[PDB]
Every structure is written in structure tokens, then in C-alpha cells.
Design a protein around this ligand. Structure first.
Ligand code: BTN
Ligand code: BTN
Lengths: 322, 322
């Protein structure tokens, strides 16, 4: 329905109070009975809405599905992002982003409940299942030299880890340069790309997938042991909207650090969070493949690694498996 | 008309011979009189087509306007580019490119007779006048590390200079890192951008403007002395299609060098072509502005410059004025 979102927006915008059939009806300027219709549908979609006669309606709990209207109430109150785009299903949130950012300077982000052609590093396939995870791309506009990309990744990583962690009862670590783990479960992968040119950056596009509500029964055969959702590590139900809120809060925070700090200022912190140490690693380099021990992250965000032949490298990136 | 292009294509594809009303009519499968209609229109648009009874039609000369159909006969015969997009008018060939390259790996390019929101380095305004210049963006897919961008620029520059030069009676020089001059006239500016990410490059987008057919009367007040079109330096009329052909030929050539050479291998050549030496230069650096002498291009494509206080810098880029 045309007003379903406007109605939702009034409900959320109005917690923790009830609002009347009539109140709302006046605001959108439509019959009160048109409102009953909207609400019964919303309920029927799985919204917890308390309706008491004489008092009105209280939005209690939202479904594992994304609503533009309520997300708008996020971008409004935000002083990082201009706007956002919300989708039920879509080729890729990244694709969409890389399109939507041309010929403008907006900072914004994009959510989908499901991706059909969702991809990870190296045009890998990324499973984006309906209503199970956060599948989001994030466009930012930091005016810095293109080389600075790699630094961004490092900062965001902690941002992402932190948000996830606030909801996990188990240890959320980072697996440089792009993976967030909980114990042995990839809870999240994330991809930092950019459009840029010698004279600096046109935009940063951070694609983030975070597994939210999966049960091991949900993961393909090819991965079932090294994947874990936030829910397998939270005692209570994980509210996809509650989480989103903290995650932006954190993505933001971390971004300004990115913009006003060197790497060193978070370096140690980042170290204490990595789970790549003292264990053997399987690096892969188009054609080439080999092993090695991760020995340190230098001031500059490079991984220093003693390979299996005692030979010492400095990598800005890498493709690592355990 | 629906078949105007298909008809053009047959004409071009058939030089230096005539083809009949009937011949063509059979090929597209439409009445011969539908053909007369097409041709008279084409003529009326300014095509030189020789029609002799009993013999048929010979395409002699094309207008200062771009035809998809004939451009297709270029991408077909090309083993660099997959396809191309041709427009009468458009926001930007670059914008268009940055859109069209998402979610695919095509190598292709885009022409417009006129840009409305045509832009140069630094979101500068770029005058793209109807039927007067080559306004083209070029998407390539060289799998290399993102750092390699700057090297591409260097190679292309010579490519561009060469093509232009084959038609100039005057000295076509380069003004690192992005401008092609003839004497004191900017004949062409060109912008190299990319979409990429730590693990290498998603695409290279080279935006190229080249002034073709302008008379000093055509240039705004704000620039009339330091701008020149290829035509002011060619004795004969400059055939925008003849030129395009050489230019791709050259853009290609130069690109493979880019992919199979170091910079040094063309370094000296590039030097002999620059016009930045032994003259004072006005560098500009957001807020800062200062002077200096260009003293050398190092093996790595960096400009070495003695500034006005004897202080020595290595720039990968710069913003320079005379
Ligand atoms: O490869 C990885 O390790 C992580 C990939 C990141 C996936 C995110 S989900 C949001 C998004 N949209 C995409 O098309 N890919 C991603
Ligand atoms: O700023 C310069 O010195 C040169 C700019 C390059 C202009 C090319 S024309 C093709 C194209 N499309 C654009 O939007 N800009 C350019």
C-alpha cells in the first residue's frame, strides 16, 4: 500500500507512546479505515503492533525484513549519510551503489533483504539469503589521496567487529584484511572499493555482509563448519534494526578516526583483535600458492610475514586461509 | 528512420564501390522506395553520396556528426573493444561510461557530438560544442595493481599526441600529466580515472576531449589565446572519422606498450615531446600555490621539480599553468 511506510514511520517516530487511528489518519490525510487496512496488513507481515481501543497503536517489534520508511528515520537523524535505498531483492547492493554514486557527491547506503548476484573478493560468490543477514553497501566521500584506501579498511574492520561484538557472548576477532570471525565462524566478510584518480578519491564503497539469523542447517555443504551467524552467539533474539543502529554508530566513529588519525594510533588495538597470529596461514597469489607465519602489522598497515622458507615479506593485502 | 543506420552501414562497408537501390533493399528487406527516402534524408543531413542510375550509390564523405552504424563497423574490426555507444547529446561521456561499466567486463567506448555537463580535472567545466571535437570516454580492463594508474596516463598521452600529430603541420607537444598542446594551444585535455580495490583494477576510464574544427571565434572570452583546434594546424579539412581511426589505432598500440613495458622504455621519447622544460611553472595544491622549474621525469613517471626556493620535489601528479 501507498502509505504503509508513512504509517510505519509515524509508529516508530512515536515510541514509546500510542497514537490513534484518528491521529495518524489526519497526518497522512486518508480515511481512518484506510489506516485499519494498513495496520492489519503490517501485522500480517509480522509487525508486533499493540492496538488498544481509545488509546491507539504502539509499534513493539519489527520483522526480519527492512522498511524504507523506518530506515529514513535513520538517515534523517544522521550527520554522515544523506540518504539510503532499501530493497527486498536485488542484483547486488554494491552494483547498485556503484551506479547510484555517479555524477553526485552524496554519502549514502543501500540495504537489501536478499541479493541474487551477491559477490565477495575476487568475484567470488557470496550467499545473501532472504531476511538472514545485513547485506549493505556504504558510499563515503573522504577527500584524501587514492593510496589511503587500505588504511580505511583497517579502521572500518574494527568498527564492524565492535558492532557485531556488542551482541556476541563469544570472542569476535578480525582476520585481516577483510574477514570478521567469531571463534571459527566467518560472521562477516567486507569489501572496500573505490572510484578514484591521481588527484584523489571520488568515492569509497564499502560492501558489508554480516550473517545474522542463520542456523548451521542454513549453510551450504561447501562451508558449514567455518561459518557462523551472530545469532549462534547471542542468548536473546537479535533485532536486525537494533544491530543496524549500533553498526552505523560504529562505522561512523571508526571513519572519523580514519580521517583524523594515523594507523599507529589504533595499531595495537587492531593487533589484540586479530586472530592470525601463531598459526599457520595459506596465502594464494594468482598461480602461486604458499604457506607462512603472520609476524606483525607495521605502522603503515602492512602485514609482515615469514613464509615457509624463512623469507620475509610486506603485504598491503593477501588472500589467507586457515 | 529505423534503417538509416543499417543503410549507412551498407554504404560504408562497400567502398569504393557503388551498390544499387535494389541490392540494399534486398539486404534489409524493405521497399526500394523506402531506401530512396532514407538516402535523401542522409544526403539532406550532409552526406556526400554519389547516386548514378544503373550503377547505384557511393558513400564519399560523412558530416561532422557521429553515426552508430558506421562506428559499429569499427568495433567489429577491433580486437581491443567489444562495443561502443554513440550519442548526439549527453550529460557526460565519462558519466555514461562510469555507469555502463558496472557488473561486466566489457572493453568499450562512448562518443557524443555534444556534452551538456562535460567536466575536466577537478570538476572543472569542459566546453563540449556540437560537432566540433572528439568527446569520448574509453573503458579498459588491464589486470594490474591499482598503483599502476599513473603509468597508463603517461603511455596514452603519447598515443594521443601521435594521432593528433599525424594531422598537424605544427609541433604537437605534451604538458604532463594530462594536456596535449600545439604551440600554445591546448588541443586536447584527457582524464584517467579508475574503479579499483586493493586486489587490483576493475576498470580504467580514460576521458578524452580533442578540439577538432574550431575557429578562434568559437572559444569563450576566458580562454581564446591558449586554445587551438586540430583544424587551425591542418591545411586540408580534417575528417572526424579519419582521425578517430588513427586515434584508436594509436590508443591501442600505446596501451599494449603500457602492459608489456616499463616506463623507461618510452621515458626519453616522452621527454622529447614534453613542453614543460626550461620554462617557469605555476603549481597549485589546494590552498597552496607556488612556482618552479621542471627538471626531469624519473624512471617511475614522477616529475622532479626545483621549486622557487631551491627545494626539490617528486610529484606523481601536479596542476601546472604557464
Ligand atoms: O569476500 C568476502 O570475504 C566478503 C564480501 C562482502 C559481501 C558484501 S554483502 C554486501 C554486498 N554486496 C555485494 O555484492 N557483496 C557484498
Ligand atoms: O581537464 C582537462 O584538462 C581535460 C578533461 C577531459 C575532457 C573529456 S571530454 C570527454 C569527456 N567527458 C567528460 O565528462 N570530460 C571529458
Amino acid at each position: 500500500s501507498k502509505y504503509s511506510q508513512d504509517v510505519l514511520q509515524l509508529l516508530y517516530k512515536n515510541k514509546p507512546n500510542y497514537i490513534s487511528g484518528q491521529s495518524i489518519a489526519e497526518s497522512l490525510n486518508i480515511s481512518r479505515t484506510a489506516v485499519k487496512k494498513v495496520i492489519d496488513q503490517l501485522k500480517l507481515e509480522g509487525c508486533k503492533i499493540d492496538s488498544v481501543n481509545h488509546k491507539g497503536h504502539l509499534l513493539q517489534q519489527l520483522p526480519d525484513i527492512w522498511y524504507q520508511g523506518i530506515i529514513d528515520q535513520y538517515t534523517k537523524s544522521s550527520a554522515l549519510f544523506d540518504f539510503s535505498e532499501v530493497y527486498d531483492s536485488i542484483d547486488s547492493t554494491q552494483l547498485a551503489a556503484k551506479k547510484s554514486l555517479v555524477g553526485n557527491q552524496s554519502s549514502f547506503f543501500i540495504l537489501s533483504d536478499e541479493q541474487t548476484k551477491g559477490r565477495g573478493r575476487f568475484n567470488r560468490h557470496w550467499s545473501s539469503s532472504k531476511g538472514q543477514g545485513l547485506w549493505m553497501s556504504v558510499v563515503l566521500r573522504p577527500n584524501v589521496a587514492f593510496s589511503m584506501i587500505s588504511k580505511f579498511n583497517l579502521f572500518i574492520a574494527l568498527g564492524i567487529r565492535d558492532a557485531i561484538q556488542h551482541f556476541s557472548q563469544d570472542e569476535v576477532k578480525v582476520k585481516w584484511p577483510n574477514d570478521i570471525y567469531i571463534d571459527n565462524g566467518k560472521v562477516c566478510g567486507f569489501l572496500t572499493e573505490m572510484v578514484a584518480n591521481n588527484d584523489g578519491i571520488e568515492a569509497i564503497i564499502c560492501g558489508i555482509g554480516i550473517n545474522l539469523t542463520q542456523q548451521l542447517e542454513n549453510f551450504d555443504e561447501s562451508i558449514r563448519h567455518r561459518a557462523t551467524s551472530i545469532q549462534l552467539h547471542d542468548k536473546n533474539k537479535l533485532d536486525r534494526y537494533q544491530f543496524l543502529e549500533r553498526l552505523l554508530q560504529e562505522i561512523e566513529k571508526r571513519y572519523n578516526q580514519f580521517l583524523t588519525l594515523p594507523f599507529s594510533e589504533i595499531r595495537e588495538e587492531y593487533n589484540a583483535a586479530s586472530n592470525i597470529w601463531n598459526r599457520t596461514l595459506l596465502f594464494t597469489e594468482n598461480d602461486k600458492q604458499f604457506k607462512g607465519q603472520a609476524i606483525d602489522l607495521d605502522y603503515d598497515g602492512y602485514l609482515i610475514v615469514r613464509d615457509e622458507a624463512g623469507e620475509s615479506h610486506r603485504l598491503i593485502s593477501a588472500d589467507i586461509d586457515f
